[PDB]
C-alpha cells in the first residue's frame, strides 16, 4: 500500500477519458495504417516506450480569468525525445500519445482546470470555448497524476514524415479562479507535463538516413547553444552577438534576410565579401585638389553583377545616407575602408585610400537627403576624411571592404546605430508588428567606432552597439532548406533559453522575424550567463511568451 506522495516512472495515475477515445478509431487507424506494411518498433517491453519523459512546465496564478489558455500542444512525434530520434529512419507514422499532468499544490487552495481535445480544422487561440467541448475537470488539490490520451484524428491513411497533414491539438484552460484563502504574496502554482507513446503508435516504411535529412524537416537545430553564446554573428555587421534588443514600435529588414520559404527580397548573398561596382560618376567639390573630399554615385537598377537582384551591388548596407559636408564627422553612419578604381583595366587609384561612408540618397548632384524606398533612389559614397586628388571619370568604379564601423563625432558612444526609422527597404517586403504582448527583437553586437578604435565592451567611455535582424547561421540555414510544411501563418516556432537565474522564450514567425514577450520595455537583455537552449515546437501566435529573469 504505497502512498500518493511517491510516484513511479511507469505510473499513469488516474486515467481520465474523453468521448473522442473510441474503439472504432483504433481499429480503423491500425487497419488503414496497414498499407505501409507491418508495424515497426512495436516491442512492448522496451525502456523507451514504458516510461514517461519530461515535456514542459507552466504557471497558474490567481489573476487568470476563466477561459484563459494555459497550455497547448500539437500532435507530433517531436513531443517525445525518443520518437524524434527514431523518425530519421522511417517515412511514415501513425498513432496516439499520452500526456501526464502533475499539479504542485496543497490542500488549502481552491480552483479547477479543464482539458479537451480539439479536432483538426479548428483555429486555436483566444475565444476558443473549451467548456463546450467534451472535457475533464481537474482540481488544484489533486495528489496523484492525471493522464489523458490524444488519439489520431486524421484524414490521411498515414502521416508522411516531411508532410504529416492535419492533426488534433490538446488545450488546457481555466475552469474556476485559483483561490488562496490566506491572501498575500504566495499566489502561483506549477504544473508539469510528461509524455509517453500509446499502445498503437508505430512507424511503417524504412529508408536510408542519407535521404531527406533532419535539417530539412524542422528548423530546431538551426538555433543551438553555441550560436547565441560564442560562435554566431549578426547578419548586418558581422560581429559577435552579445545581447537582445527589444523594438516596441516595429521594423522591416529586407537585405540579407530570409523567410521560411527559401526566398529573399534583398540584394545580398548570405556572406560577407567585397562590394564591387563599375560605371558610376565620380567627382570632387571645389577646385583645389589637396585634402579634398571624394564623391561617387550610381543609379539603382543598373548594377549587373548579382544573379539575385540589381537594386544595389552585393554587400551594400541597407542604411539611409546621412548627409554631411565640411569638417564634421556624421552621427551613426556606415563607414568602411576602400578606394576608387579605374574601369578600363581594373587598376586601383593608390592615392585615393580613405574611409568612405555609404548609403541611399535621392539627389546626388543636387541637395542631399536620405531615402528609404529603393524606387527612384541611388547609391552614394563619400569619404569622411580628407583624401589626395580626385578622379572625374564618368564610368569610374568603387571598391569597398566587407565589414564596417560606426561613424561617431566624439569619443563617447551613442544608441544602437540601426534605428527602425532609417532602414532602406525594397517595396514588397512585410513588416514585423506586435502580436498582443509579443514584440519583435533584434540581435545586438559590440561594434567599434571611428572616434575610439580601442573601445570594447565594458569600457569607461560607453559601449557601442549595432543590431541585426537574424543571426548569420540561421539565415545561412534558411537559404539551403525549405520549411513550408513546418509552420502555419499565425504560429511561432518556440525555443526555451535558460540562464543562471531565470528563463525566457523566443519565437520565430513564417516571415523570418524573432519575437519575445516583454511588452513595452526597451532594456537590453544581457545574454552572458546563458546555459542551455531547447526547442519546443509550434505554438499559437496570440499567446504570451514567458519572460521572467528570476
Amino acid at each position: 500500500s504505497v502512498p500518493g506522495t511517491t510516484t513511479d516512472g511507469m505510473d499513469p495515475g488516474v486515467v481520465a477519458t474523453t468521448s473522442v477515445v473510441t474503439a472504432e478509431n483504433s481499429s480503423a487507424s491500425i487497419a488503414t495504417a496497414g498499407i505501409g506494411g507491418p508495424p515497426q518498433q512495436v516491442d512492448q517491453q522496451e525502456t523507451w516506450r514504458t516510461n514517461f519523459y519530461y515535456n514542459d512546465v507552466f504557471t497558474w496564478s490567481v489573476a487568470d480569468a476563466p477561459g484563459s489558455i494555459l497550455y497547448t500542444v500539437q500532435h507530433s512525434p517531436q513531443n517525445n525525445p525518443f520518437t524524434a530520434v527514431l523518425s530519421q529512419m522511417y517515412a511514415g507514422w501513425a498513432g496516439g500519445m499520452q500526456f501526464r499532468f502533475i499539479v504542485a499544490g496543497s490542500g488549502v487552495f481552491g480552483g479547477r482546470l479543464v482539458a479537451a481535445v480539439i479536432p483538426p480544422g479548428i483555429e486555436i487561440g483566444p475565444g476558443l470555448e473549451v467548456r463546450q467541448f467534451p472535457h475533464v475537470v481537474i482540481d488544484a488539490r489533486s495528489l496523484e497524476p492525471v493522464t489523458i490520451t490524444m488519439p489520431d484524428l486524421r484524414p490521411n491513411m498515414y502521416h508522411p514524415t516531411g508532410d504529416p497533414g492535419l492533426v488534433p491539438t490538446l488545450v488546457l484552460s481555466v475552469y474556476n479562479n485559483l483561490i488562496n484563502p490566506f491572501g498575500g504574496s504566495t499566489s502561483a502554482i506549477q504544473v508539469t507535463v510528461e509524455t509517453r507513446p500509446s499502445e498503437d503508435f508505430e512507424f511503417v516504411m524504412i529508408r536510408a538516413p542519407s535521404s531527406k535529412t533532419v535539417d530539412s524537416i524542422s528548423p530546431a537545430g538551426l538555433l543551438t547553444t553555441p550560436v547565441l553564446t560564442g560562435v554566431g554573428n549578426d547578419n548586418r555587421w558581422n560581429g559577435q552577438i552579445v545581447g537582445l534588443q527589444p523594438v516596441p514600435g516595429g521594423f522591416s529588414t529586407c537585405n540579407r534576410h530570409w523567410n521560411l520559404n527559401g526566398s529573399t527580397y534583398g540584394w545580398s548573398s548570405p556572406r560577407f565579401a567585397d562590394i564591387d561596382h563599375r560605371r558610376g560618376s565620380a567627382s570632387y567639390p571645389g577646385n583645389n585638389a589637396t585634402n579634398v573630399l571624394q564623391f561617387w554615385y550610381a543609379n539603382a537598377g543598373s548594377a549587373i553583377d548579382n544573379p539575385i537582384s540589381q537594386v544595389a551591388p552585393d554587400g551594400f548596407p541597407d542604411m539611409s545616407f546621412v548627409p554631411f559636408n565640411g569638417p564634421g564627422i556624421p552621427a551613426a553612419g556606415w563607414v568602411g575602408f576602400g578606394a576608387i578604381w579605374n574601369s578600363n583595366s581594373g587598376a586601383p587609384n593608390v592615392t585615393t585610400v580613405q574611409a568612405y561612408e555609404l548609403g541611399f540618397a535621392t539627389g546626388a548632384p543636387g541637395n542631399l537627403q536620405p531615402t528609404t524606398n529603393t524606387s527612384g533612389s541611388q547609391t552614394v559614397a563619400k569619404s569622411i576624411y580628407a583624401v589626395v586628388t580626385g578622379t572625374a571619370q564618368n564610368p569610374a568604379g568603387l571598391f569597398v571592404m566587407a565589414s564596417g564601423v560606426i561613424s561617431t563625432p566624439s569619443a563617447n558612444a551613442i544608441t544602437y546605430t540601426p534605428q527602425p526609422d532609417r532602414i532602406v527597404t525594397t517595396p514588397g517586403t512585410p513588416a514585423a508588428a506586435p502580436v498582443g504582448k509579443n514584440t519583435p527583437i533584434m540581435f545586438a553586437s559590440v561594434v567599434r567606432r571611428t572616434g575610439d578604435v580601442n573601445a570594447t565592451a565594458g569600457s569607461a567611455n560607453g559601449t557601442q552597439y549595432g543590431t541585426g535582424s537574424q543571426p548569420l547561421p540561421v539565415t545561412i540555414g534558411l537559404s539551403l532548406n525549405n520549411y513550408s510544411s513546418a509552420l502555419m501563418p499565425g504560429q511561432f516556432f518556440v525555443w526555451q533559453l535558460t540562464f543562471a537565474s531565470g528563463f525566457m522564450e523566443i519565437g520565430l514567425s513564417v516571415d523570418g522575424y524573432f519575437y519575445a514577450g516583454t511588452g513595452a520595455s526597451t532594456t537590453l537583455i544581457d545574454l552572458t550567463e546563458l546555459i542551455d537552449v531547447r526547442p519546443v515546437g509550434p505554438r499559437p501566435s496570440k499567446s504570451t511568451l514567458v519572460f521572467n529573469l528570476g
Partner: peptide, 10 residues
C-alpha cells in the same frame, strides 16, 4: 484491424 475488414465484409 480485423473488426474493420469484418464490418466491411458483413
Amino acid at each position: 484491424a480485423a473488426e474493420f475488414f469484418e464490418g466491411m465484409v458483413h
